[PDB]
């Protein structure tokens, strides 16, 4: 199988993909210079991509046009066995009627709203059953250190069902990008943390599942990550959030 990668850290995923047999990495690039990957998609390669920047929706459509269902969005935390447990517990009524999704993520990547919030919205979308959004409100700032774009953001989503999601994102040089999400229903709440603390101490040790291995397994074999429609819903959320951060008022969708 021929494979291409679209990410801010393309050498990261290309190395793990070559480390498996029967697979060949024909292209790896960032969304800044995506065309070698786009031509690989036209030529038949499976493409694993992180979410594109909010400014490059035409590049996103070019990738959809080039690969069709051969395009897979990278959302590691969706592949946790822990996340399957949470989704089933909620669908079975473990927290009553679902009303609200909360959560937090820290990343080292600049522009944390576009770079990290999709990872939380992917989990929300899975448990919300792909509900469409009615309004998006967001605020951002550059207080914390970074190169370009916001280093902190909060967004709140009001869905057509009346359910609410609200997520906080921040930059930090040693963050992992691993999200923690909390699902609130009218009889309880449950938290899914993709990066819990395994060991305490002066240098705490990060626990969790081998989400990279699980995500690549699915991509080399429709799994629990966002399909194309789910990615487009979330990407539209992101665009609206950037607009709200500028207007200071929610954006209707």
């Amino acid at each position: 199988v021929k494979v291409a990668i679209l990410s801010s850290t393309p050498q990261a995923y290309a190395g793990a993909l070559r480390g498996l047999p029967d697979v060949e990495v024909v292209a790896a690039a960032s969304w800044d210079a995506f065309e070698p990957v786009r031509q690989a998609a036209e030529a038949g390669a499976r493409v694993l991509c992180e979410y594109p920047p909010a400014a490059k929706e035409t590049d996103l459509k070019a990738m959809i046009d080039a690969a069709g269902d051969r395009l897979t969005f990278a959302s590691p935390a969706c592949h946790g066995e822990a996340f399957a447990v949470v989704r089933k517990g909620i669908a079975d009524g473990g927290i009553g009627e679902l009303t609200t999704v909360l959560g937090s993520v820290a990343t080292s990547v600049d522009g944390v709203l576009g770079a990290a919030a999709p990872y939380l919205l992917d989990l929300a979308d899975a448990v919300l059953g792909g509900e469409p959004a009615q309004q998006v409100y967001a605020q951002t700032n550059i207080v914390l250190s970074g190169r370009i774009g916001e280093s902190a953001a909060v967004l709140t989503v009001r869905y057509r069902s009346g359910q609410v999601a609200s997520f906080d994102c921040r930059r930090h040089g040693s963050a992992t990008g691993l999200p923690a999400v909390t699902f609130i229903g009218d009889q309880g709440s449950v938290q899914y943390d993709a990066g819990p603390q395994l060991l305490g101490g002066e240098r705490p040790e990060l626990g969790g599942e081998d989400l990279e291995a699980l995500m690549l397994k699915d991509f080399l074999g429709d799994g629990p990550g966002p399909d194309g429609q789910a990615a487009l819903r979330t990407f539209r959320i992101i665009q609206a959030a950037y607009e709200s951060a500028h207007t200071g008022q929610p954006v209707d969708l």
Partner: protein, 322 residues
């Protein structure tokens, strides 16, 4: 001489405040229109006053432990008699009422505080101490969540437009955010659930607010009422600035922890927040240093929760001019 405190009201908060004032060395006169004040006073050895006027006569301060809608007249009555004010939160039922109280207190040169209990418990006071002393650098982002089971019915009247039961819970988190990050200039909130009162014990509602601060810092404040006391209360926060992050979960074990076996007779909540609060207010009204919460903080809290309720109702964000 002993500080003289007029305590107005005789409900549960009044009872907690009374114990704390007496423990602080103060002398208290209790008064409520429903007469409950005289058995309250008798149980603790305090004086039962026969009217509001007689409670105020010769008092140094009044502690207003009555429902919100009555704070305004009581406080103004107290200010006119030269008596300083401690008001149960929130200071008043509208921003306009709160401003009149603040203004009147200034013009008369008497002290005005509100009992924002959260500031007087160790996790939040330590967080503010870290932030104000510079150990977090410049504040950037904070999340706060206040969740509890309401163990008695809401018998007062409040409308969904006013934010209802969510307003009560939001006070804690809104005040904490303002305390750590500064003035709030923009508020957005989504309120979920049947939130008007009268409402039963165990009513469920979830309020999610995003506050933008004058500095550019942003806080997410979540206020919840839960269906069961499992647990009765949970508070959590995570605050990040250029100097690092500070976190808290009230579920973490503290000094006393039943590790196994299910014992139920090891309850320990820490020092009474009311002892800490009233002792600090006592010191102020006695001519000492000002307490950790001022008049402008009490007004801030009213402004923020009314902006939130408006945002929740209209679907717009609400700006607050400094």
């Amino acid at each position: 001489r002993q500080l003289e405190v007029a305590l107005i009201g005789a409900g549960l908060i009044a009872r907690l405040h009374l114990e704390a004032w007496l423990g602080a060395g103060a002398a208290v006169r209790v008064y409520s229109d429903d007469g409950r004040s005289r058995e309250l006073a008798a149980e603790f050895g305090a004086k039962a006053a026969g009217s509001l006027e007689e409670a105020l006569d010769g008092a140094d301060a009044v502690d207003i432990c009555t429902p919100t809608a009555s704070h305004h007249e009581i406080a103004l009555t107290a200010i006119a008699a030269g008596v300083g004010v401690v008001c149960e939160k929130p200071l008043a039922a509208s921003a306009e009422e709160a401003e009149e109280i603040v203004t009147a207190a200034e013009r008369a040169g008497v002290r005005l505080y509100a009992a924002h209990d959260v500031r007087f418990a160790a996790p939040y006071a330590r967080l503010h101490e870290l932030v104000a002393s510079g150990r977090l650098g410049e504040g950037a982002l904070g999340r706060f969540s206040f969740s509890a089971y309401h163990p008695r019915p809401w018998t007062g009247h409040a409308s969904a437009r006013s934010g209802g039961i969510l307003t009560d819970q939001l006070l804690h988190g809104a005040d904490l955010a303002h305390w750590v990050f500064g003035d709030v200039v923009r508020v957005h909130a989504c309120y979920q659930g049947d939130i008007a009162t009268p409402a039963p014990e165990g009513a469920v509602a979830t309020g999610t607010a995003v506050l933008t601060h004058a500095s550019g810092a942003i806080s997410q404040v979540v206020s919840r009422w839960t269906a069961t006391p499992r647990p009765p209360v949970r508070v959590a926060f995570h605050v990040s600035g250029t100097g690092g992050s500070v976190s808290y979960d009230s579920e973490w074990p503290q000094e006393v922890r039943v590790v196994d076996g299910g014992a139920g007779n090891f309850a320990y909540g820490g020092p009474s927040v009311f002892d800490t609060e009233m002792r600090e207010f006592a010191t102020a009204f006695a001519g000492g240093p000002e307490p950790r919460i001022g008049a402008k903080d009490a007004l801030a809290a009213v402004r923020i929760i009314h902006a939130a309720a408006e945002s929740a109702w209209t679907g717009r964000a609400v700006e607050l001019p400094v």
